[model samples]
Target: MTAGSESSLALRLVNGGDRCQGRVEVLYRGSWGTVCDDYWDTNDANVVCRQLGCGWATSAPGNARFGQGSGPIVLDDVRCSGHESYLWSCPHNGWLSHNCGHHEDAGVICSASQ
Candidate 1:
């Protein structure tokens, strides 16, 4: 992966019915990437929710629940403590190194933004 400022690292959601609910994707090297569903849970989703300013996580749906993505699998084996300000800060299996397919894409549902 090309080196860049972590400040440039970004996150986004897609394919769900609304902005706060969808497949989790990351922006790295100027491209969008997906996260694997391996070990994905509400804690991980919670970080994503907070990052998105979407309140707290309600559920973490896996197995491409939102829809399959076409970008690189940016993260895997993600583990979060439910108190992080961002998802990538949590432990993970290094970027673009995963043993999952688009079918295993992860997704999230958060409480509506207040």
Candidate 2:
């Protein structure tokens, strides 16, 4: 058996109770990880909202607005232009590279599901 057609890069929200809002986490290399809030912005949140079929982003909250995460910090210094199809497609320091703790996890508030 081998891997399926699921996209290699996946993202999700946690702790917000609503599927459209929560702490930002990424699925990479068969493991889930968190993203640092460094350089995070609404532009970055927009891509995440759109990618998840959650429409546009309302606000990009940091300092663990949702809750503290537990895992490897997957990305840091994300610099999205808000025109990307996927959050992973944005510019970042590198995979699994970060200078932050769980307290610095990033979060997003989507406008509405589309």
Candidate 3:
């Protein structure tokens, strides 16, 4: 996997009924990718939502809640404690070296942005 500046990483929510829910997408290696559902929990989702300036993580949806994303399956085995400033700060397998498929893509449901 390419290791660009970590400072450029970006996050977003997509395909949900509202802005608060959707497939989780992280921008890294100069492209967008998906997170795997393995070990994903509300704590992990909370960090994501909080980082995006969203209020909080309402839910952590598995089995591709939003939809299957294209490009790389970016992260897996995420272990967050719900207080991180960014998703990459959590314990994970690093970029693009996951043992999961796109079908296992993880998604997040966040509360309204405040």
Predicted model with the maximum lDDT:
1
> Evaluated with TM-score, which candidate comes out highest?
1
Q: Could you list the CA RMSD of all candidates, in the order they appear?
A: 2.1, 3.3, 2.4
**Which residue pairs come into collision in candidate 1?**
none
Clashing pairs in 2: none
Alpha-carbon runs more than 4 Å astray in model 1: 1-3
Worst 10 residues of 1 by lDDT: 1-10
**Model 1, span 1-114: residue lDDT tens:** 235647689998898878899999998777899999999999999999999988899899999999999999989999999898888789999888899999999999989732
Least well predicted 10-residue stretch by lDDT in candidate 3: 1-10
Error of 2 at 84 (Å): 0.4
Native-to-model Cα distance after best TM-score fit, residue 66 in candidate 2, in Å: 0.5
TM-score of 1: 0.93
Off by over 4 Å in 2: 1-6
lDDT winner between 1 and 3, please give it.
1
* Model 1 lDDT, full chain set: 0.91
- Clash totals in order: 0, 0, 0
Best-to-worst lDDT order: 1, 2, 3
Q: Write the per-residue lDDT of candidate 3 for residues 1-114, one digit (tens) a residue.
A: 235666688888888776667899888867889999999999999999888777899889899877888869888999999999999889898888799888889998788732
